[PDB]
Symmetry: C2
Subunit: 183 residues, 2 copies
């Protein structure tokens, strides 16, 4: 069933991202370039939306989920799977272009400051290699947010350029006159 502007956006983006091979982009992240690491189980979550108290500005949060597996010769970690959660926030801007068609684009697309969450799969124990994991978690937290937002943001931008013309104009018209439509 059709919904308001808010809900219609998140539904449009989700489908757009998924169709853009978003999950496919995740499974091709080169970490070996920076043992062995294979990327699996990508999943896109419920997008979020927030609107400035003025109603003039609109931000979107894109939560992702992913599972990578590592092959270490260590004893407890012969095979290991980690589950890591990631969030991306970005501002959406109204832009007149071409013959004045007003398409939406990304503004400040950066990784959400403190929102990296890692855990162990298959019910393994941390203590057996709690000193080893410290090596990874430190590395990932300093190489993932840059790698992710460097591959996702160009996709999110291209998706916004393919939104429904009437969806855009309505949202913009709301933003301009500062009308809250998000709940």
């Amino acid at each position: 069933s059709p919904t308001g502007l808010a809900g219609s956006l998140t539904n449009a983006l989700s489908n757009g991202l998924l169709s853009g091979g978003l999950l496919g982009i995740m499974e091709n992240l080169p970490l070996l370039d920076i043992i062995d690491i294979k990327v699996t189980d990508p999943q896109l979550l419920e997008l979020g939306l927030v609107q400035s108290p003025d109603g003039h500005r609109l931000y979107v949060t894109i939560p992702l989920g992913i599972k990578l597996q590592v092959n270490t010769p260590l004893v407890g970690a012969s095979l290991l799977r980690l589950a890591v959660k990631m969030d991306i926030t970005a501002e959406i801007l109204a832009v007149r272009d071409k013959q004045e068609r007003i398409h939406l684009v990304l503004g400040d697309c950066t990784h959400s400051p403190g929102s990296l969450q890692i855990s162990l799969l298959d019910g393994l124990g941390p203590l057996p290699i709690q000193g080893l994991l410290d090596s990874l978690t430190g590395i990932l937290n300093k190489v993932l947010p840059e790698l992710v937002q460097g591959n996702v943001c160009p996709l999110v931008n291209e998706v916004l350029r393919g939104l429904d013309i009437t969806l855009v104009h309505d949202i913009v018209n709301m933003l301009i006159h500062g009308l809250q439509f998000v709940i």
Copy 2:
């Protein structure tokens, strides 16, 4: 660079029509149309004659109902919103005169109804039906398939005078129900556009 009201997530207007379109079909409007009691218009010499002389008709069968693409128009100021519901109906009329047997009529009509943004005694806002009325010059009857031109002349007259009030009387409650059962955010966003008079319907 030209609009044509004929034939996924999208704007407010397009969401509204699709909401009403799917809301009427699951009404089920298409069933209501096909079961209109047109035979009641016809239903010892005083008990036999029935006002204008359409007495000969034996039976009136309603077939092939269809819903066309709903249309939307917004006030030039942008505070008022009207919807046109284009309907369709075939008609089969039975006479005992050999040879006629069957008259096939094709009727098309529109229902233009105002969508208001009213508020109740809880100060909360609803989308409520307003002037639901038959679109005056929308009624159009077609002959489709010898002295019939005297009966046809009488039939169309009654159809023109009854079908609107009949259809409108059966459709208006339906659409009024759907509007009150719309998505909450859909309603809210639409109202807000109207309050501030912002064109969200394409023209």
